[PDB]
Each structure stands twice: as C-alpha cells, then as structure tokens.
C-alpha cells in the first residue's frame, strides 16, 4: 500500500488494476520539525507546599481559600507522592498537569470525614454536598484527599471543625455561608434562641483517634482551574526553548499546545490583549510571553494528494499532485528530477508542455495531464 | 407529608417519664431489651 503512489492507488481502489484518471490517495501535511515551549520565565517558586503543609485549615462550611499567582506549577510532584490516598481529579488528570498551564488556581482546603470524600464531586448529593460545600456539575480540577489522623483528631472529641446539619435551601457552587443563624423547622415558631424544632444549625464534628476509616479526618484540598483566555500567571516547571519563525513547529505558547508555522504579524495588538482569534474563532495570533510580539499562526501547509496515472494496462508510471502546496515545502517523492508548480498545486512527475491538447486527466485550474512521448 | 409508605404500624403502650429514652432506637435498658425492642434501621417517629 505504501511502496509507491501507484501502490497506494491500487490499495485505495481495492483493485490490482487502476483505470486512467486521477485518484485521491492520502493527505500530505508537513510534519512539525521541532518543539518550542515559551511562557513567563521562572517568575517565582509556588507556595503550593504551604497549602497542604499549613498548620491548620478552616472548617467545611467556612472553608478557607487561597489564590495562586506568579507561580511555578509543579504538579506531578504531588501526584508521585504516595501520602495522598485520594487523587481522583475529575476534570483533568494529575499526571499531565505540568504539560498545561492555566490562568489562576484556587486551593481551598476543608476537612471532611472519611467516606464523605466521595460526597464532594461533580453532581453528588449528601450532607456536605448540599449543606456545606458543593462542587459544580462541570468541574475541572483535582481533589487531593489524604488521611490526617495524626494532627486533626484528638481523644475526647475534636470539635474544632463544624458543619451545617440543617439549611433552609440547597447550596450554589463555590458559595461560602458563615451566617450560623438558628434555623426553625415545621411550624417555625422559634423567633428566640431555643425552641421546639429550633436548634443550632452547626453541630460540632466528632473526631476520635479510635475511629474507623469512613469516619476519619480526611483533609481535602481541591484545586480549581479556569479556561485560558486571560493571560496565565501560574505555569509549570517546563524548559523553555528558542522559538522559530516561518518554520513549521509544535508550539506550546502559554499552554496553547498546538502546531503550525509562525509568520510575522502585521496586526497591532493593544497592550492589554494577549491572544488572537480568527473570524471563525480559531487561534490566528499569539503574543509570545518572553518577547511581547505578535506572530500569526498560519496553519501548517496541507492538502490532498492525488495520483495522476494512465491505466496500468498503459504504464506503471505515475505523477503525484500535492494540492494547494507551494513546491518548496514538498520534500519535508523519488522522482524529484522534474517538479512543476500550478494553482492546483505541486505537480511532481509530469513535465510542462507549452502546446495544448484535449483534456485527458483533469488536474485542475485549467491544466490537464496526459501520458505522451 | 411528602413521603409514601406501603403500611404504617402504630404501637401504643404506657411507660414512665425516664423510660422514654428506652423507646429511642439504639438504646439499652429493661424496657428496651425485655418489653419493646426497636430495629436500628427504624424509619418512623416516636410520640409520647
């Protein structure tokens, strides 16, 4: 199937004999030549360590929240460590977080008990999920839970952290309620402090070291990320390499992680705008982080490949046609002696004739090729 | 008022004041262990 263009035409046609004509066999896309990675240069070391290693984190209802910016996003060091019993990131995977790099990070920590770890997840129902903290049904982030018996739990009752046993309504995602106001049920007659069907919504948690796994201190830190439209300030420990211009390349500009060729851009970006887009919402520009310049991401050259041959009954000689590609970037065919260029594309294997004849194999753009002495 | 059940059983008896906690599920005592024992999976309301 890939010995030569005639073999490819035979395979695609599913026949050992190929009639005279032009048959599309494959698509020729110029493969990337190298890899380039650019983002802000070693801005600062991230305090991610202080998120998990801090002495204390707040309760479930009044959960703390730290914001990560001007950081190095060293993620997989946390994944590799075996101390983290639960690391089921729902929106993403923790082994590839260093590859990408995001606009901002929220590292909010709240200690729930044991089996209630599964209660926090996109689209879950329970006590914590309804009354203390609900994660959005469309969640893109990690959940980093581990046993924390050695510090949080204490004998005789660890009542530091609390939770809302009764709430009048459900919880909107990422909403923190610290009202702690007495709630009435049934006929709601308790306008005072204490009354029938009237009790404090916050009953203290109980953690004892003599407790089972399902009812154990399980400290949880759930990182959250947002899609990259604004410039990204937290990006992982990746090696930055020199960019290339006018050369097709795999690029990772601030997490774009796409392929293409970077021509010079005559469009002027206003200083606040970072990224670019086309009429049809595809990336068509990018501001390189290190050097604040604009370089249009025109796509890597591609186009159909058509084998232009007479019948196998006539001859086994073929002439390929790289459609819509300038002949310079074709080599990235064995018969390189003669190369022709036309609006249809690089026509390799056929030699131009100044004379004109009736069309036999229609190439396109008003030129037709035939097999002739 | 928003839940439905196949059947409901009403069990009436007389106990003194301090024996009310015995009728509470997951409790021990003379009344709970020898007079009227309740399942730990009890789904209902106790009235006194």
């Amino acid at each position: 199937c890939a010995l030569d263009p005639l073999s490819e035409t035979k395979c695609t046609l599913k026949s050992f004999t190929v009639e005279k004509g032009i048959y599309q066999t494959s698509n020729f896309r110029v493969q990337p030549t190298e890899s380039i990675v650019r983002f802000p240069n070693i801005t600062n070391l991230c305090p991610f360590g202080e998120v998990f290693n801090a002495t204390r984190f707040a309760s479930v209802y009044a959960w703390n929240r730290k914001r990560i910016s001007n950081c190095v996003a060293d993620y997989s060091v946390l994944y590799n460590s075996a101390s983290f019993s639960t690391f089921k990131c729902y929106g993403v995977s923790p082994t590839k977080l260093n590859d990408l790099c995001f606009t901002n990070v929220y590292a909010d920590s709240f200690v729930i008990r044991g089996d209630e770890v599964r209660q926090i997840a996109p689209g879950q129902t329970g006590k914590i999920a309804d009354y203390n903290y609900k994660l959005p049904d469309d969640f893109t982030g990690c959940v980093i839970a581990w046993n924390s018996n050695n510090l949080d739990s204490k004998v005789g009752g660890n009542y530091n952290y609390l939770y809302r046993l009764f709430r009048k309504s459900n919880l909107k995602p990422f909403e923190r309620d610290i009202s702690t106001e007495i709630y009435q049920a049934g006929s709601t007659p308790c306008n005072g402090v204490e009354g029938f069907n009237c009790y404090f919504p916050l009953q203290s948690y109980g953690f004892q070291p003599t407790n089972g796994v399902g009812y154990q201190p399980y400290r949880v830190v759930v990182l959250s990320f947002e899609l990259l439209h604004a410039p990204a300030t937290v990006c992982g420990p990746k090696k930055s390499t020199n960019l290339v211009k006018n050369k097709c390349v795999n690029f990772n500009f601030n997490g774009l992680t796409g392929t293409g060729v970077l021509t010079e851009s005559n469009k002027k970006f206003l200083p606040f705008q970072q990224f670019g887009r086309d009429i049809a919402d595809t990336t068509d520009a990018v501001r390189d982080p290190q050097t604040l310049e604009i370089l249009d991401i025109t796509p890597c050259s591609f186009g159909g490949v058509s084998v232009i041959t007479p019948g196998t009954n006539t001859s086994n000689q073929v002439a390929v046609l790289y459609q819509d590609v300038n002949c310079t970037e074709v080599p990235v065919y064995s018969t390189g002696s003669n190369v022709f260029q036309t609006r249809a594309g690089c026509l390799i294997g056929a030699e131009h004739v100044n004379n004109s004849y009736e069309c036999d194999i229609p190439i396109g753009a008003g030129i037709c090729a035939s097999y002739q002495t | 008022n928003d839940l439905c059940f196949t059947n409901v059983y009403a069990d009436s008896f007389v106990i003194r004041g301090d024996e009310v906690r015995q009728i509470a599920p997951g409790q021990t005592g003379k009344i709970a262990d020898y007079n009227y024992k309740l399942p730990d999976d009890f789904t209902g309301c106790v009235i006194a």
Partner: antibody
Framework: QSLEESGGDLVKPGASLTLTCTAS????????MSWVRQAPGKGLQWIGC???????TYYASWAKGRFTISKTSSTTVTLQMTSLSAADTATYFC?????????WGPGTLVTVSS | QVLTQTPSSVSAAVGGTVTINCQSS???????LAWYQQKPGQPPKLLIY???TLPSGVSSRFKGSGSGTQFTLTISGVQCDDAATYYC?????????????FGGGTEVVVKR
C-alpha cells in the same frame, strides 16, 4: 462508655470456641475495634479487626485462616476460633481502635487444656 | 514487622527522668505509633499517641520524639503509680509487614 467480653471457658484442643464483646452506650458502627491476646507470661499481640465498611481482611500473619472476626449485630461482635492449641492460651481483650485505642473491656481468659 | 523494645527492662527513680527506645524494622505509616501502659491483670491504658500528641485526661509528663524508623518516649517523673509495661503500637502501611504490630514489654521499677 464500656465494653464487656464473654465466652471464656476450658475447652479441649482442636475444638471451636465463640467469643463475644458487647458495646454499652454506643454501637460498633462508628468506633474502630480490634481483637488482642496477652499470654500470662508473654507479650501482647493482635489478631483481627473490622468496623464500618468490610474490614475483616486485616488479620495477623501468624493467625492465618483459623482466625475470623464478624459482628453479628450492631452492638455485639463475635470471634470464631479453630484448631486450638496449648500455645493459644491468653487473655482476650476487646480493643477499641486500630492504631490508637481508648478503653477495653476487663478481658476474658481462654485457657486450652485436655 | 516486629518492633524491638531496647532495653527490655528499664529502672528509674521517682524524680529521675525516664527514657525508652522502640525501633521499628520498617518505616511506620504517616506517624501512627502509639504507646499504652499495661498494669498487671488489666488491659493497657493510653498514655501517648501519634508519637507526641497527648490524649485528653492524662498527666503532663509524657513527651515523645523521633519519626520514621526510630522513636523514643521521655517521661519527666514518676509518682510510683506508673509501674507498667509499655507497648509501642506500630501502625504500618498495611499489607506490608503484616497490617500492624505490637512490640515487647518495657516495665519500669522504682527503687525505694
């Protein structure tokens, strides 16, 4: 909050025996539990433990397959023994917790003799 | 998996400080060491858990040091009522070296 054991008696070697510790004031569905033995002239060693989700799997290596632990109901946990030997004589305490324990029962001795 | 109580026997005075060493063959699981004082004829009572954290309702005389493989207990003083064997309860990353283990006894005598 108290625990009490039962089932200690003289039993010939090679015969099965049932032990049981009962929880008073609390149910064996929130607080961790463990099963331990102490020979009269030897150190203390643990055999089995189960609470909350199925946790019976954790057994002592020397205990092997002749040791099993199961909770018949919420407040009572029973211990089943097989292949009794003279080296199995010890005092049986119902521990409360895997790595950390608060309080145990008085302990029922199970002597094995023929 | 067996934890060694070195020395097996320890002798100390009422006003004399008490130290003991409990070594674990393998690394413990996330600082899960415990210590219980076993008075004769009665199950042991908790004195120190998670190496150094003090339980509620115990005297302020027991302090623990060490982590990983080596750990130690230090007691400031004895009121003659702490004559009991101490067992260092070694929690392990379970399914490796059993699931947890108990060491040998270490009783403290007071000379009067």
């Amino acid at each position: 909050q108290s625990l009490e054991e039962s089932g200690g008696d003289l039993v010939k070697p090679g015969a099965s025996l049932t032990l049981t510790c009962t929880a008073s004031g609390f149910t064996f569905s929130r607080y961790y539990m463990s099963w331990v033995r102490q020979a009269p002239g030897k150190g203390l060693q643990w055999i089995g433990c189960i609470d909350n989700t199925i946790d019976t799997t954790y057994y002592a290596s020397w205990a092997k397959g002749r040791f099993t632990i199961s909770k018949t109901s919420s407040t009572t946990v029973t211990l089943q023994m097989t292949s009794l030997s003279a080296a199995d004589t010890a005092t049986y305490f119902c521990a409360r917790g895997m790595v950390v324990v608060d309080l145990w029962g008085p302990g029922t001795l199970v002597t094995v003799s023929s | 998996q067996v934890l060694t109580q070195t020395p097996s026997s320890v002798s100390a005075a009422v006003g004399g400080t008490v130290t003991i060493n409990c070594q674990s063959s393998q690394s413990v699981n996330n600082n899960d060491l415990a210590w219980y004082q076993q008075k004769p004829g009665q199950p042991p009572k908790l004195l120190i858990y998670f190496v150094s954290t003090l339980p509620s309702g115990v005297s302020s005389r027991f302090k623990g040091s060490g982590s990983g493989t080596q750990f130690t207990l230090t007691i400031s003083g004895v009121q003659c009522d702490d004559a009991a064997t101490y067992y260092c309860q070694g929690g392990f990353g379970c399914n490796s070296g059993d699931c947890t283990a108990f060491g040998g006894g270490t009783e403290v005598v007071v000379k009067r």
